[PDB]
């Protein structure tokens, strides 16, 4: 992984030693080059994972998550450089440094062999993310959003640290390859119930699980666009990636410990989908849409079937591009009208025709139109939960109806109807904004031609 | 907020339209349109207002009972089949300011004339505001009515968005 | 019920402006200033059939003949119906006729 870690680190001197007016050009060009080389991780084998060294490994789960992570950095830079234009030079370079450092922590997090190394980088991501929200958010509520984000995470993560250290004492290793062979079954006792909770709750909060999700709508409504993109696209998936790995050592106790969380997720996805129908803030609507989508991922991980694990992987990747695209779409309106209220600016299709097309394509992926990888992921989870229990189809089917209604309600409210008369500063879509939207949707749809690369190890 | 006369005349027009929806055929509608006009005529000179209000009150109850559940609606009227149909083609005039110079170059004469309208709007704004200030009571305007231009060479205050509004069939 | 004198005057003034504005939407003769029998009906149909039927059917047939049908079970046909009294091209076998019917 040194061929990715080191060039990522080099982006920092690159940004700091650039000419004043070339910080965005240089950082964007070379982060795109790093993303190109990330495709070399597709050397996956049917039986063995790609095991580089004693520290780092990559398998079919972490590979698509790595490529998404390295793809997002250039997109984030493009998305940020307009609202940061008036910032002074040193504070721009600091902002870019936080983005680079987040990428560095993330690629190491998704490839760490040892669970305690994973924990430390898993936790290091809080610092740049918190700094980005509270320093470069626009509103007073960003300070409170930072605190909710910080302490929800640490409330669950500190128990995880104790559980992991306890496991290493008992088993002798936290190396994931070792744990695949030395894993022992988990017996019923109150000790193991709390071991199970300590091992899972930190990941549930990050997904987020319904009931522990209140931090998320705060964090998005307050974060700057780049903070929203990485928060939605990648940082939520730390929780999903965490469970997909740690559930290896929690069987067979997951048979019954999953029940409370499957119920919260199955009911939660309907509650949070219904909430989207009455949201007045466009960014808050997109944030609540993430909670509903990640509820499926939690259910998929908890029922532990080959089909559910494949659907969970595809869903995490697909939601990453869709949700980040939706935040970018909402931000482009915000840069003109400087408000997140959905009903403020309407009929925008009349004024911005091509942008309305990006809105349509993002909506259709959000509601999982076949054969998008959004639909592939959701369908695989639906297929596997039906085998878990036939009645889940009622809840899963109802959530599909609600998802269409709010996905198209958002499209109809902002794009259709009559334009607002007094909003006369809707300038034409910039080339930068159009390129930003295409760099989301084009790879998303191209993946429909070869879905296997985003289906994970169980493929 | 509607006077008694306004209420009675609105009921007459509404009742004739629902009557025409029932009759369909023109000769049949003419027959019953005259019978209906006779009923309104039978009480035209009622002077005791209490009695007249009772007549109007009862007539509205009779109208509600006998209204057509699917009356004819003019296609472009609210609730009609063409209502708001062309709104997606109505583009505000300010959008033209954002045209690329090569787009404006295609209509040199249109954009020269447009520049004169913007000059007229600019030169007239301060007088428009001043007229509204000095013609509005101290508390504020009590109705939505606007005045005309008084002096020659002045424009009626708040004219731009009425004059330059989109055409009803903009394409 | 009727326009007040002040309402009449304002409508008259707005009416003059609106009609001048609409008249100003007419395009001048030079606008837009743009930068720089039977047989001809056979041609368009001939070139269209060549680029939209012949070329695509050349591509599909090549694709089907040399890639798809070179793999097992990619194109599966229902076997032909065989009736009594038929002759098989592959073998030359002759299917016997049905029995003699009763009269009906």
């Amino acid at each position: 992984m040194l061929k990715y870690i080191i060039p990522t680190i080099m982006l920092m001197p690159l940004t700091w030693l650039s000419k004043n007016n070339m910080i965005w050009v240089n950082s964007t060009a070379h982060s795109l080059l790093i993303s190109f080389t990330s495709l070399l991780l597709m050397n996956q084998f049917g039986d063995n994972s790609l095991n580089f060294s004693l520290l780092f490994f990559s398998d079919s789960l972490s590979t698509p998550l790595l490529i998404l992570t390295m793809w997002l950095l250039p997109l984030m830079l493009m998305a940020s450089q307009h609202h940061l234009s008036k910032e002074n030079l040193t504070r721009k370079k600091l902002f870019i440094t936080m983005l680079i450092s987040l990428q560095l922590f993330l690629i190491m997090t998704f490839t760490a062999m040892e669970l305690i190394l994973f924990y430390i980088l898993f936790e290091a991501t809080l610092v740049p993310t918190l700094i980005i929200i509270t320093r470069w958010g626009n509103q007073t509520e960003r300070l409170n959003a930072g605190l909710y984000f910080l302490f929800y995470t640490l409330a669950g993560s500190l128990p995880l640290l104790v559980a992991l250290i306890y496991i290493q004492n008992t088993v002798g290793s936290l190396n994931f390859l070792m744990l695949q062979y030395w894993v022992q079954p988990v017996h019923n006792s109150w000790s193991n119930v709390f071991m199970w909770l300590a091992c899972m709750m930190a990941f549930m909060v990050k997904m987020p699980l319904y009931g522990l999700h209140l931090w998320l709508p705060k964090a998005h409504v307050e974060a700057p666009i780049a903070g929203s993109m990485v928060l939605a696209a990648v940082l939520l998936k730390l929780g999903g990636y965490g469970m997909l790995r740690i559930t290896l050592i929690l069987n067979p106790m997951t048979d019954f410990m999953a029940y409370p969380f499957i119920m919260l997720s199955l009911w939660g996805m309907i509650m949070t989908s219904s909430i989207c129908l009455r949201q007045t803030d466009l960014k808050s609507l997109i944030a609540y849409s993430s909670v509903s989508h990640m509820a499926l991922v939690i259910v998929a991980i908890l029922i532990q079937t080959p089909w559910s694990y494949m659907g969970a992987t595809a869903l995490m990747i697909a939601h990453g591009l869709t949700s980040s695209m939706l935040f970018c779409l909402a931000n482009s309106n915000y840069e003109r009208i400087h408000s997140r209220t959905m009903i403020l600016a309407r009929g925008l299709q009349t004024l911005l025709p091509l942008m309305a097309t990006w809105w349509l394509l993002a909506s259709l992926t959000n509601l999982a139109l076949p054969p998008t990888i959004n639909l592939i992921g959701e369908l695989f989870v639906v297929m596997s939960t039906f085998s878990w229990s036939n009645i889940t189809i009622i809840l899963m089917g109802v959530n599909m109806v609600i998802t269409a209604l709010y996905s198209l309600y958002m499209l109809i409210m902002t794009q259709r109807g009559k334009y607002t008369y007094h909003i006369n500063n809707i300038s034409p879509s910039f080339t930068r904004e159009n390129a930003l939207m295409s760099l989301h949707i084009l790879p998303l749809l191209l993946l429909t031609l070869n879905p296997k690369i985003i289906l994970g190890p169980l493929y | 907020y509607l006077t008694h006369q306004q209420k009675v005349l609105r009921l007459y027009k509404r009742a004739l339209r629902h009557l025409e929806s029932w009759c369909i055929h023109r000769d049949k509608y003419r027959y019953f349109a005259c019978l209906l006009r006779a009923r309104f005529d039978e009480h035209k000179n009622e002077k005791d207002m209490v009695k007249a209000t009772q007549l109007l009150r009862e007539a509205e109850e009779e109208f509600w009972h006998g209204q057509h559940p699917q009356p004819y609606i003019f296609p472009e009227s609210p609730g009609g089949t063409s209502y708001e149909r062309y709104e997606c083609y109505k583009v505000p005039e300010w959008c033209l300011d954002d045209w690329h110079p090569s787009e404006k170059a295609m209509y040199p004469d249109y954009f020269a004339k447009r520049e004169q309208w913007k000059k007229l709007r600019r030169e007239s704004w301060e007088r428009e505001v001043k007229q509204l200030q000095e013609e509005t009571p101290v508390g504020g305007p009590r109705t939505e009515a606007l005045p005309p231009a008084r002096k020659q060479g002045d424009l009626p205050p708040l004219w731009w968005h009425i004059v330059t509004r989109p055409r009803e069939r903009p394409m | 019920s009727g326009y007040t004198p002040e309402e009449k005057l304002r409508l008259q003034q707005l009416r003059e402006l609106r009609r001048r504005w609409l008249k100003d939407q007419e395009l001048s003769p030079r606008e837009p200033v743009l930068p720089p029998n039977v047989i001809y009906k056979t041609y368009r149909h001939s070139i269209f059939a060549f680029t939209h039927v012949l070329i695509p059917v050349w591509i599909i047939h090549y694709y089907l003949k040399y890639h798809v049908t070179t793999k097992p079970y990619t194109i599966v046909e229902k076997k032909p119906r065989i009736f009594p009294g038929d002759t098989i091209l592959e073998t030359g076998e002759v299917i016997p006729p049905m029995k003699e019917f009763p009269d009906q």
Binding site: - | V91, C95, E103, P166 | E26, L27
Partner: peptide, 12 residues
């Protein structure tokens, strides 16, 4: 006659 059609800019 022919009337100018007010559209948003299509150049970009």
């Amino acid at each position: 006659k022919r009337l100018f059609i007010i559209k948003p800019s299509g150049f970009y």
